[PDB]
Amino acid sequence: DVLMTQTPLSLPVSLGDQVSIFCTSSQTIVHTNGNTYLEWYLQKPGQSPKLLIYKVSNRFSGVPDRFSGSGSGTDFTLKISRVETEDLGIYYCFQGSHFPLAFGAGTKLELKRADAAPTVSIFPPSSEQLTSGGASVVCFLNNFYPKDINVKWKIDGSERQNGVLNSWTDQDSKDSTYSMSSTLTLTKDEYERHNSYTCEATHKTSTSPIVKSFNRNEC
Amino acid sequence: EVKLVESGGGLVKPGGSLKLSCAASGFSFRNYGMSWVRQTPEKRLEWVASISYGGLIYYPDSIKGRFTISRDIAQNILYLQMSSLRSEDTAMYHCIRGDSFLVWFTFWGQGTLVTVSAAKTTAPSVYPLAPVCGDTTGSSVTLGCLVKGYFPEPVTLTWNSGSLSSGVHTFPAVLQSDLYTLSSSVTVTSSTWPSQSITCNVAHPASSTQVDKKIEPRGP
Ligand SMILES: Cc1c2ccccc2c(CCC(=O)O)c2ccccc12
């Protein structure tokens, strides 16, 4: 089995930049007929994947002249001589030289911008949820950049790294930042067992976490 | 104009069966290789099966035996019989025409969604997220809405019926335990809220659900 490896999983770029996206095979991908079936696809948000390059270096008809492909042995490369706003999305490589046919994880082309500290907002369980017998403490880490962030919870000073659901937004088409919601879910009784609920954010803009908290009984 | 239209996608319980169809146009099957490729919720692309212009069939070991590609050359329709279905088989299915010994996936269809789950139609739980006494001590105020345990997807969330658009962040749903949970945050000026009315309008069509929750300041 040939496994296709793509890096990085996220490539931050500025428009007008010449970029190279890499893809590696776990072993050689030459078909028995001499051809190397390495293809590159661009999946534009909302749409389906579309062919860009076939057989390592052949630009498919209708594909812009800024896209090219190259590679040999186990290293293949996708080039975009000058990036536009339409080129943003995820790029997938794929080898069809050997069975099973393999897809790479994909590389998301995203926009670079100035660092942005996240705005951390913490919200205790709604009085309504409590009646139903549940307790969900949500916390929003919004409009931050870069996209790498760590959210830690601490119930009464003690870290509670269990039962937390996190979701992330795609880069904002407007300001180009990222946002994320982290929902800790407990029970009315377990929730009523603690007082201090805390949400700490470790962004490359803090190291010493952005902390937002509250006390069940008071503030 | 070449066309590929997938149909048959839908909700199927584990171990169950489903038949996907793909109506083609612009070309003939005897001249092109056909394949099915799926994109899982994680956005991962996986090859499911392909049939050559001649009839040769190929499956990856995980699909082999459970799924079956067949084609109606006469009515130029490609199929994919699915059985022994698992939750990981949940993905968007695309049929694709390729060029034999030239390019595998030259032309993709928009796809059809197949969701494998034992979950039952459950209306969402919509809770109003009011800020803690701390946050509110500034220029802006971020509010929120928790839309818990609903099935199936999707639900539609707005603020003040759409009146509140800028400064909103609606997060992608996630399965918590066979049920979907989603959350949205809305940031506005301090003099905007609670001075002005702010409501989270959530609808879950599948369960004929249309609920509204006004965000009120907490405190005794
Ligand atoms: C698109 C497509 C191909 C595209 C590029 C290269 C080979 C292709 C093959 C045959 C592959 C093989 O025999 O290993 C196919 C076999 C069946 C159906 C489609 C096929």
A181–B125: do the CB atoms touch at under 8 Å?
no
Q: What are phi and psi of B61, to 5 degrees?
A: -50, -30
Q: Identify the experimental approach.
A: X-ray
Residue nearest atom 17 of ligand 1, based on CA coordinates: B52
Say if B110 is an interface residue toward chain A (CB within 8 Å). Answer: yes
Look at residues B59, B83, B118 and tell me which one is the last residue of a structural domain.
Answer: B118
Superfamily holding A114-216: Immunoglobulins (2.60.40.10)
Look at residues B118, B138, B163 and tell me which one is the last residue of a structural domain.
Answer: B118
**Right CATH number for A1-113 from 3.40.350.10, 3.40.50.2000, 2.60.40.10, 3.40.50.970?**
2.60.40.10
Query: Same domain, yes or no, for B108 and B136?
Result: no
Sign of CA dihedral A37, A40, A43, A44: negative
CA distances to A96, B53, B113, B210 from B76, in Å: 25, 12, 21, 42
Instruction: Determine the structural domain holding residue B34 and report its residue range.
Output: 1-118
B100 lines ligand 1 (CB under 6 A): yes
A36 lines ligand 1 (CB under 6 A): no
Find the B53 Cα to ligand 1 centroid distance in Å.
9
B144–A129: do the CB atoms touch at under 8 Å?
no
In DSSP terms, which residues pair with A158 in a beta bridge? A155
The beta strand positions in B85-208, using DSSP E, are 91-99, 103-108, 112-116, 125-129, 140-150, 156-159, 168-170, 174-175, 180-189, 199-204
B47 lines ligand 1 (CB under 6 A): no
- The b/e string for B127-142 (b: 16+ C-beta within 10 A; e otherwise) is bbbbbbeebbeeeebb
Q: Return the DSSP state at B58.
A: E
Look at residues B118, B138, B153 and tell me which one is the last residue of a structural domain.
Answer: B118
Resolution in A: 2.3
Q: Which of A37, A48, A180 sits opposite B104 (nearest CB)?
A: A37
B52 lines ligand 1 (CB under 6 A): yes
Q: Which amino acid is at A80?
A: I
Question: How many structural domains does chain B have?
Answer: 2
Angle at A96 between CA A94 and CA A98, to 5 degrees: 125
- The b/e string for A71-98 (b: 16+ C-beta within 10 A; e otherwise) is beeeebbbebeebeeebbbbbbbbbbbb
Find the B52 Cα to ligand 1 centroid distance in Å.
7
Query: Same domain, yes or no, for B127 and B195?
Result: yes
Angle at A134 between CA A131 and CA A135, to 5 degrees: 110
